[PDB]
Nucleic acid binder design. Structure first.
Ligand SMILES: [Mg+2]
Ligand SMILES: [Mg+2]
Ligand SMILES: [Mg+2]
Ligand SMILES: [Mg+2]
Ligand SMILES: [Mg+2]
Ligand SMILES: [Mg+2]
Ligand SMILES: [Mg+2]
Ligand SMILES: [Mg+2]
Ligand SMILES: [Mg+2]
Ligand SMILES: [Mg+2]
Ligand SMILES: [Mg+2]
Ligand SMILES: [Mg+2]
Ligand SMILES: [Mg+2]
Ligand SMILES: [Mg+2]
Ligand SMILES: [Mg+2]
Ligand SMILES: [Mg+2]
Ligand SMILES: [Mg+2]
Ligand SMILES: [Mg+2]
Ligand SMILES: [Mg+2]
Ligand SMILES: [Mg+2]
Ligand SMILES: [Mg+2]
Ligand SMILES: [Mg+2]
Ligand SMILES: [Mg+2]
Ligand SMILES: [Mg+2]
Ligand SMILES: [Mg+2]
Ligand SMILES: [Mg+2]
Ligand SMILES: [Mg+2]
Ligand SMILES: [Mg+2]
Ligand SMILES: [Mg+2]
Ligand SMILES: [Mg+2]
Ligand SMILES: [Mg+2]
Ligand SMILES: [Mg+2]
Ligand SMILES: [Mg+2]
Ligand SMILES: [Mg+2]
Ligand SMILES: [Mg+2]
Ligand SMILES: [Mg+2]
Ligand SMILES: [Mg+2]
Ligand SMILES: [Mg+2]
Ligand SMILES: [Mg+2]
Ligand SMILES: [Mg+2]
Ligand SMILES: [Mg+2]
Ligand SMILES: [Mg+2]
Ligand SMILES: [Mg+2]
Ligand SMILES: [Mg+2]
Ligand SMILES: [Mg+2]
Lengths: 206, 14, 87, 122, 149, 41, 179, 26, 46, 97
RNA sequence: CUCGCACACGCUUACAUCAGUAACUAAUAAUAUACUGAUAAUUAACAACCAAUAAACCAAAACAACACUAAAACGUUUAUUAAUUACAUUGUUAACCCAACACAGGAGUGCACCAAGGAAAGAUUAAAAGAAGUAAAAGGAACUCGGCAAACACAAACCCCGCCU
RNA sequence: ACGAGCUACCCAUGAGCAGUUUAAAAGAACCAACUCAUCUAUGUGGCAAAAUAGUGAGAAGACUUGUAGGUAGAGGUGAAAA
RNA sequence: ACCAAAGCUAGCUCAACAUACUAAACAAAUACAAAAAUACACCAAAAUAAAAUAAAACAUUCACCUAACAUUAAAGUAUAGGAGAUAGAAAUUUUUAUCCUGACGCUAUAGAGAUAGUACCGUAAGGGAAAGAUGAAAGAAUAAAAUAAAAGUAAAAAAAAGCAAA
């Protein structure tokens, strides 16, 4: 299932259907539109899970790993570099667990760094002779591998145990289709031995 | 002539 | 609740009738005969998958009809809730 | 006044307005006013035997998927009739006039489950 | 099945068969005290008594005896932020009375765990102790206790 | 080309400065101040 | 087998219940029609059980344990239905050549629009049908004016959408002078 | 929104005057 | 005597006077429906 | 009469962009070009207003005559009503007569 | 103090359970059938959809014995065809509808005049003026356009105009 | 173009009138339900854009009333009050 | 000190080019009382525009008035007109291909009515709105800074006498 959003919607690093986002922007609000630089999917070279460097901010020159990207506002966020401190445990007469949350950053402020020399580079998309599209650095002239990142589900295929209601891999990949010219209905009738002799009468369509 | 002025109700939204 | 039998409430004339008016000298009953309808036939119940209902329908018909007719006799004689029956 | 945006269902009218909710009919009206239900009009669920079925509603998580290749008429023909046509043409017995032996149905009015008129719901 | 075109029936036509049914039903706990042999389902609005009887007798092999259906109307009174009525969908409710004397009671699908209750009590006690130790000393009169001297 | 007056604040204040010491609403309301200031002059 | 509407009794109180991934179109196509027909009811039972669990969770005012199972089951059933529909469409294209499984015609109703009138199944021909005969598939001469208004309204909407998009592009170029 | 800079500058002068009248600098 | 209650509701009269079939049975009612469609009305008839 | 409390963003307008630098560059195309083209042909705009000038009534009349066969229904109706109103006002109303 | 129960028409969940009411609805509070959120609900036997083609058929309903005039809705049988085989579909809540309102108004029918429904007064004091009622010495229309209103009266007459309902 | 869901008049289909006096169901009489609205007093941004209280007329008929249909503005309908 | 005040965006407007013009959705149901799968029919219809106005009245007349021929002239000419108001050609002439298209148009009482033909108002045809503002981050609300500038109040009720001021 998917949620619908008004055209005048502002993205705030929160899930659109989440309670925090709902309380931040009620369904009856329409805020001023922020200018977002148009960057296409074929030109968005900032992925999730790769090491990047910070250009401007309090942590100038520091490097961190990207943990999330928001294409709507051209935002990229790194874990624990550009941080402001906030209290998460709030009660009537008790406080604590003051954690550093981190603010989002723009593509003009975050640029990819190659793992060879660990120095900032500019990334340009190139088409390899093998039929693959891999990012190629221009300052040094080297390819940057795709930063594989775990999915939000939290399960890795290397360690998975089948439950009572999961098919085995061999059963799932077993091929038993015989491509003949019979419908599913006819094949099921033949398989189960259901015999029907009489046929439908003339039916007019108009 | 029996001239009468019918009252006009305010819009319900306000 | 009685509504799950299912039973449904209705409002109309509530009468206590024996088969004849109170002026009838034959105010006592001897035997009733009740014919089951085509809806409650044995074959219909078997198709409906109600094998043990074949006797339940008879029991319900007998209980309801005989109670109604005996109570009509009693109230024709002059007995009611606060004048409970003596015979 | 009455509403106009609300749906005009059978709950919003008089006693004489008894509109169906979308269920298919299952019979007609008999002689003495009762409803005669036709057995053939009632759908019969063709439910298979799942006792010895070794498949589950979910697949293994490590099982690989495949590239999306939707089945087309060309692929179906290549799979079901192309080898037979090629073998018969090599043998020299191929008859262009008669194709009913290869699964081709010149007329759909004969068989039970017709394709264009769509005589079957599902 | 629903949202499909049933073939027209005429005298002598073949029996109508549905292979992959499109009907999905739910088993609900009755909100009112029902007899032991009555089971409450929420069924699609296109389903009939005969369809539900076949659905229960064939797919699940349940010896049903009676089926009674009604249509429950969803409320259309709640208004959106644009003063537009929001309608809860109508739904069909079916009561199925079993045949062979079987009695069905809706189970407790969320049994509370003693270990979970103990863990919750321990967490609550720890939170209360943390609040008590974070509470300022009345005798200090608002002077912070972080500084040594 | 839509033209609107943007110095109406100063236009009003130039008159209201001469009526600050009046009594009633003549020291606040511009409609009642312009008549009172003219009579004062 | 009325207990099939519920999960295993040992998983009733569990907060999270794990399950495998959803079925995919290639895996469904690899299977035969017998296995597809059986898997339809295999998924139907699980979908009914999950709907029962969701309704019970709503009734008890508790979160449903791992509600992604219902989404996975719905996706698997949709994939199976799509595979069966693709096979039926390919076979009917091979045998009859008709793209649509239901007869229809491009008609012009009294409102001037061009509609796709699907054909219904009747026991009598069209010229003997009381209900069908009083329908009108044609436009009277007074409908051309409203058709022209519809055309002009759509043209205005499209033109102002294009102007809005051009203005947005120009504003973005002015705001980000990266050239 | 009224287009113009003269009104904004004049009101900035007025705001500076009000601030000086409210908090006289030493 | 007292006015203001000139509307006595009845679904049969409502549908027979301002219904879809009533509108479409006459050329002028079709024009009314076309006008409502052009304006963009949510409900063309009762 | 409430006026804004913040400085508006000062527009950095340049006088040496392409349009401002080449404004009306071929205004003397005829005079300095051995006449073939009038300065009329350099005017870009509506078809009924290229190299022409008139008051509101004349402009409406010319628009109806030139592009009146391609106007929308309501646009043509509004143009006809405006033409009628302008005719009546100009030929029947005023002071100097 | 007594307009209550149900059905038809009408509104469509305003009905029920739990919880909350600082504020929003009640023209005020208490809290709640009228506000808020969550969850549930109206189960058919009652009601709706529920044969044609020809023929025999003058002889009212009013306790209908038999009649009056204004001449009166309401039906069986015979013959030919009526798929034939459990379980079809739909309405089942409410303190409710039409009057801008939680309006002293307008609302069909069957039952009884309470065995069912409700409360005229938020708390004081007992100024004027105002509305309603009760009683009043002697007089009894002397008031007033008029015996209007009121009354322990509630009767008999003479004209004008329309025959009369 | 839209309006006879109020109202004017018709067309179908139904329903009401209890008690008393009279060979009477007599466009008779008393008087209920019911239908109208004579007079007065309150009310006059009121309970009400026509009401409340008292008092009145009819109440087996040229009567009241439910449902549905018809007559539409250079017109309809009208026991004429334009 | 309350009430309050200020954003710059949503989007609109006018033209040019243009494929050549009733968008997307149309699984099922939709002109039975629309969204109700299923029975022996009947279907279709045309007949001038009128008037408000001008002629200071009003009777003949009254440009445009939902029918193509555009532009430069002939020309407001010949003509037609209670020969009044006004209406008004033609014969005959001119018009070189494409890009160079955006704005001395508006910025939430403006610009489309539009956040929308939606709420709401009418039996219906129909009429028809108002309502947005923090921030890079609110996954920074023991939240931070700018105005504290309208009318209306409070801080702070009034002391003979009078268009309230000089
Ligand atoms: Mg309405
Ligand atoms: Mg109904
Ligand atoms: Mg009803
Ligand atoms: Mg039956
Ligand atoms: Mg039912
Ligand atoms: Mg009204
Ligand atoms: Mg209502
Ligand atoms: Mg509630
Ligand atoms: Mg209150
Ligand atoms: Mg009820
Ligand atoms: Mg009181
Ligand atoms: Mg007094
Ligand atoms: Mg008094
Ligand atoms: Mg007295
Ligand atoms: Mg006295
Ligand atoms: Mg006197
Ligand atoms: Mg006197
Ligand atoms: Mg008197
Ligand atoms: Mg007397
Ligand atoms: Mg007297
Ligand atoms: Mg008389
Ligand atoms: Mg006489
Ligand atoms: Mg009518
Ligand atoms: Mg009528
Ligand atoms: Mg009588
Ligand atoms: Mg009489
Ligand atoms: Mg009265
Ligand atoms: Mg009195
Ligand atoms: Mg009376
Ligand atoms: Mg009388
Ligand atoms: Mg009399
Ligand atoms: Mg006239
Ligand atoms: Mg007339
Ligand atoms: Mg007269
Ligand atoms: Mg007169
Ligand atoms: Mg004139
Ligand atoms: Mg004049
Ligand atoms: Mg005159
Ligand atoms: Mg005149
Ligand atoms: Mg004219
Ligand atoms: Mg002449
Ligand atoms: Mg003259
Ligand atoms: Mg606006
Ligand atoms: Mg002030
Ligand atoms: Mg003085």
């Amino acid at each position: 299932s998917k949620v619908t959003l008004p055209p005048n919607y502002r993205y705030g690093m929160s899930r659109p259907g989440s309670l925090s986002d709902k309380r931040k922007n009620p369904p009856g609000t329409r805020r001023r539109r922020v200018p977002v630089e148009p960057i296409s999917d074929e030109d968005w070279h900032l992925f999730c899970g790769d090491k990047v460097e910070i250009l401007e901010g309090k942590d100038a020159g520091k490097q961190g790993k990207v943990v999330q990207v928001i294409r709507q506002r051209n935002w990229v966020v790194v874990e624990g570099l550009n941080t402001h401190y906030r209290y998460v445990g709030k009660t009537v007469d008790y406080r604590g667990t003051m954690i550093p949350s981190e603010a989002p950053l723009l593509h003009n402020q975050v640029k990819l760094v190659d793992p060879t020399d660990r120095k900032p580079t500019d990334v340009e998309w190139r088409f390899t002779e093998a039929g693959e599209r891999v990012r190629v650095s221009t300052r040094s002239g080297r390819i940057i591998p795709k930063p594989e990142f775990p999915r939000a589900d939290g399960i890795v295929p290397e360690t998975w145990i089948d439950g009572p209601k999961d098919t085995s891999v061999e059963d799932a990949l077993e091929k038993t289709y015989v491509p003949r010219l019979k419908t599913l209905e006819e094949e099921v009738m033949e398989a189960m031995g259901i015999q029907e002799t009489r046929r439908h009468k003339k039916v007019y369509w108009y | 002539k029996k001239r009468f002025t019918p009252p006009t109700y305010q819009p319900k939204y306000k | 609740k009685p509504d799950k039998l299912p039973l449904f409430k209705r409002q109309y004339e509530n009468t206590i009738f024996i088969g004849s008016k109170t002026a009838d000298p034959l105010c006592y009953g001897h035997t009733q005969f009740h014919l089951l309808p085509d809806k409650l036939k044995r074959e219909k119940l078997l198709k409906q998958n109600c094998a043990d209902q074949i006797e339940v329908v008879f029991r319900a018909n007998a209980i309801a009809s005989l109670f109604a007719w005996t109570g009509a006799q009693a109230m024709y004689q002059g007995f009611w809730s606060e004048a409970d029956v003596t015979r | 006044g009455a509403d106009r945006m609300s749906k005009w269902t059978s709950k919003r009218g008089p006693r004489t307005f008894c509109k169906g909710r979308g269920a298919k009919g299952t019979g007609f009206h008999g002689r003495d006013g009762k409803f005669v239900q036709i057995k053939e009009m009632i759908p019969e669920l063709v439910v298979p035997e799942l006792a010895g079925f070794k498949l589950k509603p979910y697949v293994n998580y490590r099982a690989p998927e495949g590239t999306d290749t939707p089945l087309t008429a060309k692929q179906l023909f290549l799979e079901t009739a192309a080898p037979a046509i090629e073998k018969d043409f090599k043998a020299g017995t191929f008859d262009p006039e008669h194709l009913e032996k290869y699964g081709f149905e010149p007329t759909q009015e004969g068989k039970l489950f017709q394709l264009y008129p769509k005589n079957f719901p599902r | 099945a629903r949202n499909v075109l049933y073939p027209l029936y005429q005298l002598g036509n073949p029996q109508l068969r549905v292979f992959r049914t499109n009907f999905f039903i739910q088993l609900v706990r009755p909100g009112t005290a029902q007899p032991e042999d009555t089971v409450q389902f929420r069924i699609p609005m296109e389903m009939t008594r005969v369809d539900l009887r076949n659905y229960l007798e064939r797919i699940y092999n349940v010896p049903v005896a009676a089926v009674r259906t009604r249509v429950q109307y969803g409320s259309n009174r709640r208004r959106d932020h644009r003063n537009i009525r929001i309608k809860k969908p109508d739904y069909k409710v079916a009561y199925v009375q079993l045949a062979l004397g079987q009695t069905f009671t809706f189970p407790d699908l969320f049994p509370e765990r003693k270990g979970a209750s103990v863990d919750v009590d321990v967490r609550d006690q720890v939170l209360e102790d943390q609040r008590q130790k974070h509470s300022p000393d009345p005798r200090r009169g608002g002077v912070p206790g972080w500084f040594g001297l | 080309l839509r033209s609107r007056v943007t110095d109406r604040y100063w236009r009003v204040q130039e008159v209201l400065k001469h009526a600050r010491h009046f009594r009633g609403r003549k020291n606040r309301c511009y409609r009642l101040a312009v008549r009172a200031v003219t009579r004062a002059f | 087998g009325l207990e099939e509407f519920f999960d295993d009794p040992k998983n009733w109180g569990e907060e999270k219940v794990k399950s495998g991934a959803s079925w995919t179109c290639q895996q469904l196509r690899n299977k035969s029609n017998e296995d597809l027909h059986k898997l339809w009811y295999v998924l139907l039972k699980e979908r009914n059980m999950l709907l029962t669990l969701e309704q019970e969770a709503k009734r008890q005012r508790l979160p449903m344990p791992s509600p992604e199972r219902l989404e996975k089951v719905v996706d698997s059933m949709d994939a199976l239905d799509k595979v069966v529909q693709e096979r039926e469409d390919a076979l009917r294209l091979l045998q009859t050549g008709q793209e649509k499984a239901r007869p229809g015609a491009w008609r012009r109703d009294i409102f001037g629009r061009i509609i796709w009138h699907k054909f219904k199944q009747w026991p009598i021909p069209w010229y003997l049908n009381k209900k069908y005969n009083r329908k009108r598939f044609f436009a009277m001469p007074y409908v051309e004016r409203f058709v022209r208004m519809r055309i002009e309204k759509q043209a205005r909407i499209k033109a102002r959408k294009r102007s809005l998009e051009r203005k947005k592009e120009k504003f973005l170029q002015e705001k980000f002078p990266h050239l | 929104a009224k287009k113009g800079f003269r009104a904004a500058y004049r009101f900035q002068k007025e705001l500076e005057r009000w601030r000086l009248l409210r908090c006289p600098p030493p | 005597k007292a006015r203001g209650n000139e509307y006595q509701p009845s679904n049969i009269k409502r549908k027979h006077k301002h219904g879809w079939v009533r509108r479409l049975r006459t050329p002028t009612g079709v024009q009314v429906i076309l006008r409502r469609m052009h304006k963009g009305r949510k409900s063309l008839s009762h | 009469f409430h006026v804004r409390v913040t400085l508006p963003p000062r527009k950095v307008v340049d006088r040496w962009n392409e349009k401002r630098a080449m404004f009306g560059v071929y205004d003397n195309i005829g005079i300095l070009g051995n006449f073939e083209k009038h300065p009329k042909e350099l005017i870009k705009g509506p078809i009924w207003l290229r190299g022409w000038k008139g008051n509101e009534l004349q402009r409406c009349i010319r628009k109806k005559r030139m592009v009146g066969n391609r106007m929308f229904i309501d646009d043509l109706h509004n143009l006809n009503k405006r033409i009628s109103y302008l005719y009546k006002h100009f030929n029947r109303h005023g002071k100097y007569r």
